[PDB]
Amino acid sequence: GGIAIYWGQNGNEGTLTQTCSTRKYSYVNIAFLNKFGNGQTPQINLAGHCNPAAGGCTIVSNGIRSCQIQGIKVMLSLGGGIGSYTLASQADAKNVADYLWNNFLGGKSSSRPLGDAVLDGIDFAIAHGSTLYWDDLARYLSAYSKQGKKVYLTAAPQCPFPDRYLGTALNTGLFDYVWVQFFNNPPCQYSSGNINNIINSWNRWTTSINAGKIFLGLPAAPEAAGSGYVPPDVLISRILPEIKKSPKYGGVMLWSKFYDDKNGYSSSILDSV
């Protein structure tokens, strides 16, 4: 399989161009568009990388195309752990979809936050707020594919199945890639000497949802999360041999680029994924 990486939440993790030139990642999620819905003007947060005002982040388009010519798919991640994002109604879902289409996808806008580059898809990292209308947002976005260029749909649900916020949306069967986050969740993450909970959870996910491929989401370093870190050796000799047997296995997802560099996680597991 391949490795999916989240980029954008630490200005010291390097440019998007550097990230893709490592040749270690197959998918890159730009985190995060953490503010939208309920009448709010959508706002993207890329930590210290750039300030979106006055097109301060339009420079990212260079990184996006650079990744894409290498065959790497780039998605804009909605939500994240911090933000006042939500959907107040079905109409709100439509408004946000149209916004995303004109500002990040194949539409037209005179103020595209990240530039004129056209992203491959939208990533759903909804962790709190409203539990409604996310399935509508998925449908409206998916409908734009009929205009020519496919809009990829990906999701990053928490490992407890079913997911309180993305369960309905994932049931639509419209998602291409799903990277389940097997961390910050005691009942389905790794615990020293115990891989039972994570394997049990994996089998539930790979047999319960209709998606293209499912990825094992993990923290790239002990500091990347409150709990759930899996040493590279344990992943390679105990977890991967089991989960790779599933025909739905797509690879591994890591949070995040910044911590991957410090811990050299992807460098240690790349050939085994």
Ligand X SMILES: CC(=O)N[C@@H]1[C@@H](O)[C@H](O[C@@H]2O[C@H](CO)[C@@H](O[C@@H]3O[C@H](CO)[C@@H](O[C@@H]4O[C@H](CO)[C@@H](O)[C@H](O)[C@H]4NC(C)=O)[C@H](O)[C@H]3NC(C)=O)[C@H](O)[C@H]2NC(C)=O)[C@@H](CO)O[C@H]1O
Smallest gap from residue 236 Cβ to ligand X (A): 22
Work out how close the CB of 181 gets to ligand X at its nearest, in angstroms, rounded to a whole number. Answer: 5
Tell me how far, at minimum, the Cβ of 69 lies from ligand X, in Å. Answer: 26
Cα-only R_g, the chain? 18
Instruction: State in angstroms the smallest separation of the CB of 215 from ligand X.
Output: 12
Nearer to ligand X, 2 or 80 (CB): 80
Nearer to ligand X among residue 47 and residue 199 (C-beta): 47
In this complex, which beta carbon is closest to ligand X, that of residue 81 or of residue 241? Answer: 81
Binding footprint of ligand X on the chain (CB under 6 A)? 6, 9-12, 32, 34, 45, 47-48, 80-83, 125, 127, 156, 181, 184, 224-225, 255-256
- By beta carbon distance, the residue nearest ligand X is 48
Q: Which is nearer to ligand X, 86 or 256 (CB)?
A: 256
Least distance between ligand X and beta carbon 211 (Å): 16
β-pair partners for 215: 179, 251
Residue with smaller CB distance to ligand X, 19 or 181: 181
Residues 78 and 99 sit within 8 Å (Cβ to Cβ): no
